[PDB]
Each structure stands twice: as structure tokens, then as C-alpha cells.
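Crash report, auto-generated. Payload:
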Amino acid sequence: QVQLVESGGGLVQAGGSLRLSCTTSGFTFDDYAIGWFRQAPGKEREGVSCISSSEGKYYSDSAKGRFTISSDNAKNTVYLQMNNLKPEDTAVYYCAAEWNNFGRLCMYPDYWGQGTQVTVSS
Amino acid sequence: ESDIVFLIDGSGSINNIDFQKMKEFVSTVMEQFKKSKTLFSLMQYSDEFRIHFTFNDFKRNPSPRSHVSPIKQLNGRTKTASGIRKVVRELFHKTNGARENAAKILVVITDGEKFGDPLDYKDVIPEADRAGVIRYVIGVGNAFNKPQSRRELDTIASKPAGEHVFQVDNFEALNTIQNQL
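Recovered output after restart:
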């Protein structure tokens, strides 16, 4: 039942921009804060961003200034607008949901999507 | 059957509203374990360490309002790791009333910004693991908003850290702690 489905990945050149979508179903959307995480093979995992209706938005140091998270509450979809992309941002991007009443801004998600590939070439 | 230490951040970076929320949190936890054989001890830390009550003190008078109400904020820097070391080495010791074969639980309340500590967490956390010490972390203030303070709460918490890291304004910490004991 519970689904977190990433789309909008793919190949982009350096300097370019991509918008990821995380379309969700199977849980009450407003009960969860939704975040983005990432992992390339051979590299450490990183939190990227999180959005909560009570706690606001959170960004990692790498994301801050370049990236914008938003939520279309009517369609139960969260977007990650990623500008000024670099080859070091190449990773599998996952979205995740964490129960919002913890108030933790996606530190420990309860649900994860399958991940979608983002590749950044020069 | 369980010995619970609170370790509360009283540095000057904790504002007065947050420090009172630490006292109320502590108090609500102790009230909830009142009809049980749980014992409590509390230490406040900054760049100094004050043992407000030991397990023996609580034994002799198990009144949360008696022990928690007069606690005043110390101010100063934030020596969280040395605070953890002093808990496992002194407050979890039978001289201060700690019962062998009780479950050892430490609840660290902090904004996640260690400053001025000559000890890193790598010097105190593996030792706390080797003693039986289960660590819960209650974040106040800006702790959940910056990557460094979030990492700090993860590093303190026993694993899986999502069953041990909570925010001071919710009842989720006390709900998880009740269910686990």
C-alpha cells in the first residue's frame, strides 16, 4: 500500500538543473514530513532536505543555497528543485517519510522509496 | 529494575524557556514512573558538573517536585561528552545508589552543540556501551535544524537512533520509554 515514487532523475550536464518529484500514496500525507537522501556506490549516505508543515524546511550544507524543497499538498507530492548541479551530486536519490509528530525533520525516516538515478556529467 | 539518570544541558546557549522545558520534561517522566520501582538521579552540566540528586537521594525522598523545582541554570560552555563520562563512572556506581542488575538508562537533554569539551564523543560513548547504558537524546532549541547538531544527537543515541532521539515538546520520548520498560 505505502508508496514513495521518485521521478525526474536522469542525465544532466554540470551547471544544469533537475526537478525531482516524489509522488506518494498509501498513507495520510499530512501526517508525515518528507525528505530527500542520496547515496552513490562507494560513498557515504547523506541527508539532503526535509519539509514539515510544523517544523519548516531543513537543508544540508551541500544543498543550502542551490536546492529548494516544496510540497504540493493537494497532490501529495514533494519536489526537490536542484540548481547548479555538479558531478559530485551524482547519486541515487531517495525520498522518505518520517512521522511528523516526532518533530525531527526527517532524521530517521519510517518509509523509503526505491530511489532514482541522477547522473551529472561535464 | 531500572535506574534512570537525566543529564541536562544548562549552558548559556540554552535560553531560559528551554531550560524550564527541561525541568518540566524531567518532572513528567518521574511522575509517570511513580508507582514503579524505578530510581532517578540528575546531573546538570555546562563547563562544570552539579549532581542535583543521586539514586540514594531519590530513594530517601522520591518526590519529583522536591528535587527538581529548586534546580537553577548554571550557564557556561557545553561539555556533553565529559558529562556522559561522569554519568557512567560516578552516578551509575553502587556508592551513589545504583543497583546492579537494573537496566541503566541515561537521558541527555541538549541543543546538540558541544563546545569546550576536551573529550570527543569517541572517548565516552564506547565506554557507555560497555557499561550497560542505554542512551536517549532529547533535543531542544535549534538541534534538529543544523547538520552538525543533528549528527551530535545521532552520535549520543543508542541504536536504532530513531527509537532513542526525540524532541522535548512531544510525549513521544516518554511513550517509547514507558513501552520499553
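Post-recovery validation: The longest strand of chain A covers residues 91-99.
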